[model samples]
Target: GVFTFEDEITSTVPPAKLYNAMKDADSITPKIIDDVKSVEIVEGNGGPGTIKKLTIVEDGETKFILHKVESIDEANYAYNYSVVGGVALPPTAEKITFETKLVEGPNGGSIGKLTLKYHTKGDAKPDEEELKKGKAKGEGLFRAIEGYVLANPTQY
Candidate 1:
């Protein structure tokens, strides 16, 4: 029962548009992310148990990872996610969970709050390096999304 990382980056978009990002990760994530190798469908595409495989470039090497969607709720602009990748210690992360929520702002913008939780080792104190990498990459991911939205303001 350990919480490894919690990070968020808000954007200046509406709730509906922001929510679409989650609905279309395969279609949108690669476009915004440069290091992402590929995202292929392993099983389902909607709901909590849906599975997907994502290959990403890490430390100059391509690593294949898997994840399952926990939930997707557009009304609340929230989605629960969990990483099914194995052994984050040697090469990747153990278990990771995240949720994204979009809230309308007063200045005609939307706020995206992305929170992440993970366990790198089994009861053996979370790895600092893993946490650092997680935060860095997570922040980078959010920023990439921001950049994508900013560049494609009219698309969403």
Candidate 2:
């Protein structure tokens, strides 16, 4: 199915500071998202081929292993990642990738755009209700991050 989501967040901090946050996705994901059990880097620190294992308790209270990484670019704040091959899902086969770009805002601060491309099995497409829930949760995460950084501006 064709599914893509884009979100923008403006931060009082400058691009440099926001860029630093984008570069540290592995370090921030688990801390900000409670559902994320752990994010362990298997290979590259923040570059291509960096594998991350994400454990989440599913509907049956079973652990779901979703392993992905920066299969493309990490420095430019762009990346693509797919779940490990041979994993079955009751939902659908999908791959989620996020790309971030920062531009100067009105003031000295910056605006960050997070582009998400989700490729899912056509037979099990996402419904509007699911989309609404996902969007709200995702937007909430962005706001939470912005709040955190705003409250404690980066040293950089």
TM-score of each: 0.82, 0.68
| Per-residue lDDT of model 1, residues 1-156, tens digit only | 457455556567777776766676776778788777678888875667888888888689888877788888777888777777743434334677767777887677777777778655555555677767666765676566556767787877
Query: Which prediction has the highest lDDT against the true structure?
Result: 1
CA RMSD of all predictions: 2.6, 4.0
**Local error of candidate 2 at 99, Å?**
2.4
Tens digits of per-residue lDDT for model 2, 1-156? 757888887767777666666555556666766765566666666566677666654554636555465454435534445445322333664654555566778879878776656556786676666556545644554555555567566444
Clashes of each: 4, 0
